[PDB]
Design a protein around this ligand. Structure first.
Ligand SMILES: N[C@@H](CCC(=O)N[C@@H](CS)C(=O)NCC(=O)O)C(=O)O
Ligand SMILES: N[C@@H](CCC(=O)N[C@@H](CS)C(=O)NCC(=O)O)C(=O)O
Lengths: 229, 229
């Protein structure tokens, strides 16, 4: 049976999966779990995914509860022999290493800042603390791009899809004026037709955060190319 | 050339890699990076791994900066066709999904609690908050063990090696009296000869945390079997 994706498009890891689904033209079923209404605690969803997180994928008897596993699974089943999840071991391990940087470092710090803002209100967040932590992630990604125009090498991989959604989300708040390779990479990712799958949920997240957090993101921070405007 | 592991054995993800290296009898080189003295910021290590984290593995030109990538890489190179990282796609995706639970959920919450304790002192930590967050991880792992005696099924996998080190670390602080399947699994993991590679660094972490945090872990919390005593 075809895969079922449980999602809230405001979530960056969800958007990474939506981008892969569009890029590979995968036929999936969709289920909307509204995180800002606590629907991830609904008894059937919680029994499915005890971590109460999106994205979640059901594919026959296989239940995946992490975007990075979903990206790998979908690439292996719907892009066998492709370049997004390369067959060469060293190349594949570099993509895996970068998926784990997204999970462990970039998303962790984005999520800490955004979660604090929803729970406490923007006025009660240590914004300078979060600016340092997220700028530190920008420094790292600028270094990852020193010798290549994509995160894992000269070609688009799953790592770019995982990172770009969270990067777009961080960049609602923190500008890309001092990270030229990162800004150029983001600009290039915005020209991909698959990037259209990031746009609705990024904008919904922007509006939801400004409402629930009682603030406005700095209008100058977000990088918005002509194609996406 | 043989792999080089950069490590501090106090780190649970480091200990997962030490356990795999012992289990598979892998010949690696070792480099000690003392995290409690800031040696992860030494210029050569920071150039190698901009995330300033252990474990880091150098294997020829391949540089891995995440325990979960290291576990997968080492299983693929030193246990090809084995059961720790199974070849069957659905089984492999279940192990991957659990490695990502360790990264995203269990380690995130352990690290938040332990990092707060080092930075602020135990007296300045919201222990009840961290107890709730880590008990929630215990609830999830008890559910993962409802139908199997290892985390991903009836056999030891990389998921057990990744999870047991962080679980042992959480359980210095929070008891396993209300999580019987999880306690039984931990007791079983302690009987594996590879578990000996967890013991020195768990004890060093216990002593370092009590010194730097100015507290004592509850002596009753840790589960310590006869083999490990
Ligand atoms: N490592 C996970 C992170 C998933 C995650 O934390 N998603 C958030 C939204 S960005 C979520 O579902 N939050 C709801 C909750 O934790 O209750 C992945 O990559 O899928
Ligand atoms: N997701 C990473 C986590 C690595 C990590 O954060 N390790 C800690 C020790 S438990 C570290 O090196 N901390 C030093 C620092 O962040 O400066 C992995 O699995 O390797």
């Amino acid at each position: 049976p075809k895969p079922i994706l449980y999602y809230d498009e405001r979530s960056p890891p969800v958007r990474s999966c939506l981008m892969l689904i569009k890029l590979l033209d995968i036929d999936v079923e969709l289920r909307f779990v509204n995180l800002f209404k606590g629907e991830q605690f609904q008894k059937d969803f919680l029994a499915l995914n005890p971590q109460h997180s999106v994205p979640t994928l059901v594919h026959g008897d296989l239940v995946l509860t992490d975007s990075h596993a979903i990206l790998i699974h979908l690439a292996e089943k719907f892009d066998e022999g492709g370049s997004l999840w390369p067959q060469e071991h060293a190349e594949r391990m570099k993509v895996l290493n970068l998926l784990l940087f997204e999970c462990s470092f970039l998303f962790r710090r984005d999520s800490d800042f955004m979660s604090a803002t929803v729970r406490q209100g923007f006025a009660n967040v240590d914004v300078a603390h979060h600016e340092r932590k997220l700028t530190e992630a920008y420094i790292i990604m600028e270094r990852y791009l020193e010798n290549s125009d994509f995160m894992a090498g000269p070609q688009l991989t799953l790592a770019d899809l995982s990172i770009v959604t969270t990067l777009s989300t961080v960049n609602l708040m923190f500008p890309l004026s001092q990270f030229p390779r990162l800004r150029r990479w983001f600009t290039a990712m915005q020209q991909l037709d698959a990037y259209e799958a990031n746009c609705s949920g990024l904008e919904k997240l922007r509006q939801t955060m400004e409402s629930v957090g009682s603030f406005q993101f700095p209008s100058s921070s977000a990088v918005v190319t002509e194609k996406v405007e």
